[PDB]
């Protein structure tokens, strides 16, 4: 039930969670600030870019089972946010893992829109 909720919503975990929201944008910024780096170097940058995109999917998976799935429906500040996490996770899992995609798109802006949508998270955490 809500036994794990006593552990997760602890204020020592949420500071770490938002710390990760900042860390992700740090690493992703050092990534695009170093165009043309080592091949193994563009591996752990994308390593974290996926690792920190799976953490926010597990965190959003725990804020439904131990928080109530009906608290999100009438909450527009949690629908758009979960939608952003899903979109980011899908586009990241494509860009990193699933390179089977070799169909035309004219270089899709989704690799950009997701980098942009990772700012909106920080935007909404300065509004709460």
């Amino acid at each position, epitope marked *: 039930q809500f036994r794990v909720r006593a552990v997760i919503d602890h204020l020592g975990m949420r500071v770490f969670g938002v710390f990760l929201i900042f860390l992700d944008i740090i690493l992703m910024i050092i990534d695009l600030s170093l165009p043309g780096k080592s*091949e193994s170097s563009q591996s752990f940058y*994308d390593g974290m870019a996926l690792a920190l995109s799976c953490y926010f999917m597990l965190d959003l998976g725990l804020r439904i089972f131990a928080y109530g799935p009906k608290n999100f429906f009438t909450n527009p500040w949690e629908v758009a946010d979960g939608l952003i996490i899903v979109v980011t996770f899908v586009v990241t899992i494509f860009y990193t*893992v699933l*390179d*089977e995609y070799v169909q035309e798109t004219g270089a899709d802006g989704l690799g950009r829109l997701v980098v942009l949508a990772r700012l909106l998270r920080v935007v909404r955490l300065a509004r709460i």
Partner: antibody
Amino acid sequence: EVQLVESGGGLVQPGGSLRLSCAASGFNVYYSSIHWVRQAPGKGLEWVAYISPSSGSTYYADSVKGRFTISADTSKNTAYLQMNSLRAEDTAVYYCARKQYSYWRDSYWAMDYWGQGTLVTVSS
Amino acid sequence: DIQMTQSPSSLSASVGDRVTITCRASQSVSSAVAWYQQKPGKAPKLLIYSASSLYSGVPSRFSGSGSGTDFTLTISSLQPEDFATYYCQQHQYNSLIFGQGTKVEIKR
């Protein structure tokens, strides 16, 4: 324990057709990717066809586009290459080779295991 | 359309020399380049993948070095059984392009 045994090559009248069979052993084709690369007598290597029954996408070279049709049967674990409207220039030795999928950003995979190579001669 | 210029066309070298075949790309194409060896009549066999990573079974003398757009197959100690032709290739499907080919001959 991984082998690509191919067959089907031979003499064939120009304009006529002929199919090459690349049988796989020791892996599931459904997950990897099979190419056809031919070589004209006393010439370089030329990539021809591609298939992956995973995604289902297929690509062809310009010199064979519209004439060649690379299929695959995961039932018998074998990739097929149908060569239609054969020209004299197609006279070459055909190899089939496997290349498994890379899921990183280095693409640290190449065509490790090749076929035996079968001779396709197009003449009258 | 990526131009793979493999230089030199052919080379002759004595046993145990340091052979260095170079494969230049028309543009920036990462570092996903292969090196194959083909003995006459046989099927091409993989030596190097990703331009520097050695394949299993391949001798120690075969090394891969990538610099700029120029990739380099290097044989430290040439052997009489290294008589073959050598090709450079690319990875990521539907974009794989072979090189011109280098014919290696043993001087003796």
